[PDB]
């Protein structure tokens, strides 16, 4: 179980800042010492701040930890293309008897314009359905900076299940593309009358939808 | 780490493994140690409390144990996507903090060569009535996560307009990667139809996708 929040995304100009913070509650951030680890792209996830704001060994006093209540927050100054990662709060929750940990927030240092994603929403093919399967496609491309968050729905209900997206990969227009998809049986398909993909990018959310009709 | 973990366990998928934490009388001795997993690129999630108590939806293969001043972590019929880092946690009362062993990386050894499963999927009626048209391949649950990719307009080479993402390891830790190439709506109607080679692990795939009467 997770109460902690962190924005998927920050990023800045590099020689700038950013702030990435997370909130929690009194059971969680505000009783207990947090912690911050940052992972690297295909690198294990190190520690880099303990007790709320000590640097790990290495770290520079660029990278800086504070609390303030129930929310935690990592600041970095002069922002360097090194610093490019994902990074994610850990702390004790003293109610729960275990550790919680923030979503994770990804770093980019901005190295050309920031653009929206284009998103195309493709509804089960012909030829799927007549092997009674059933993909919800969408198609997510030509954004800047390399991270989305997707949230399907059936029906305004929020999808659970059979949801995959990948990591966003850098394209040859040097923009990044990522699909997610949905496997649904013919029924399930069929059961709803429309079917919604929510892209959100930078704080800036975009819906598309489909809906089961013969050609 | 203030808990000591072993640094790595490997095992055949369907095999039984074994995660040990060592602590002392202030931590594991006395408190409910949790297990944690991490999947590569993901956040640690809960999945054993109390010391022997699963998270919900947490598979029966997981079981965990407590004994003195250790507790141990067994993956009972290893699959793929157990494959990650495994921590341990337990409040210490000596230090009245929350403490961590140092991680278990669990490797799945001669893992299984997994095909690709290849959907294509043509320009919808609402993007083509936005004078777009973007073909999407979609390329899921393949391992290893290297795949080769061709497209033909009829029987032709298409050798411009694709891209293809870099594959990525799914929830299962098998690879998806997509490949879309975007058309007029004018070069989507003209041909008989377009196609989609995939080849893996010195196999091919080949999908083909015609334009329909509407």
């Known amino acids: 179980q997770s109460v902690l929040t962190q924005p998927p995304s920050v990023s800045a100009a590099p020689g700038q800042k950013v702030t990435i913070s997370c909130?929690?509650?009194?059971?969680?951030?505000?009783?207990?010492?947090?912690?911050?680890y940052q992972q690297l792209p295909g690198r294990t996830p190190k520690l880099?701040?303990?007790?709320?704001?000590?640097?790990?060994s290495g770290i520079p006093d660029r990278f800086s930890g504070s609390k303030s209540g129930n929310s935690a927050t990592l600041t970095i100054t002069g922002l360097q293309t090194g610093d490019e990662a994902d990074?994610?709060?850990?702390?004790?929750?003293?109610?729960?008897?275990?550790?919680?940990?923030?979503?994770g927030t990804k770093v980019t240092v901005l190295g050309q314009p920031k653009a929206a994603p284009s998103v195309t929403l493709f509804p089960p093919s012909s030829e799927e359905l007549q092997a009674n399967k059933a993909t919800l496609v969408c198609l997510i491309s030509d954004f800047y900076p390399g991270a989305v968050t997707v949230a399907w729905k059936a029906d305004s209900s929020p999808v659970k299940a059979g949801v995959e997206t990948t990591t966003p990969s850098k394209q040859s227009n040097n923009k990044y593309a990522a699909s997610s998809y949905l496997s649904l049986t013919p029924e399930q398909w069929k059961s709803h009358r429309s079917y919604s993909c929510q892209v959100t990018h930078e704080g800036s959310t975009v819906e598309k939808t489909v809906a089961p009709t013969e050609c | 780490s203030v808990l000591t973990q072993p640094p790595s366990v490997s095992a055949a998928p369907g095999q039984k493994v074994t995660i040990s934490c060592?602590?002392?009388?202030?931590?594991?001795?006395?408190?409910?140690?949790?297990?944690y997993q991490q999947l590569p690129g993901r956040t640690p999630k809960l999945?054993?409390?109390?010391?022997?108590?699963?998270?919900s939806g947490i598979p029966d293969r997981f079981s965990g144990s407590k004994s003195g001043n250790s507790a141990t972590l067994t993956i009972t019929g290893l699959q793929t996507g157990d494959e990650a880092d495994?921590?341990?946690?337990?409040?210490?009362?000596?230090?009245?903090?929350?403490?961590?062993?140092?991680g278990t990386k669990v490797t799945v050894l001669g893992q299984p060569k997994a095909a690709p499963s290849v959907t294509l999927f043509p320009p919808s009626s609402e993007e083509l009535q936005a004078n777009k048209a973007t073909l999407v391949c979609l390329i899921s649950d393949f391992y290893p996560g290297a795949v080769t990719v061709a497209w033909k307009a009829d029987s032709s080479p298409v050798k411009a307009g694709v891209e293809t993402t870099t594959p990525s390891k799914q929830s299962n830790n098998k690879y998806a990667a997509s490949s879309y190439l975007s058309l007029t709506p004018e070069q989507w109607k003209s041909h008989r139809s377009y196609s989609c080679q995939v080849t893996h692990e010195g196999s091919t795939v080949e999908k083909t996708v015609a334009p329909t009467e509407c």
């Open positions: 850990g702390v004790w929750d003293s109610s729960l008897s275990g550790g919680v």
């Open positions: 009194n059971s969680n951030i505000g009783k207990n010492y």
């Open positions: 007790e709320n704001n």
């Open positions: 009388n202030s931590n594991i001795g006395k408190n409910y």
């Open positions: 109390e010391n022997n």
């Open positions: 946690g337990v409040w210490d009362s000596s230090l009245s903090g929350g403490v």
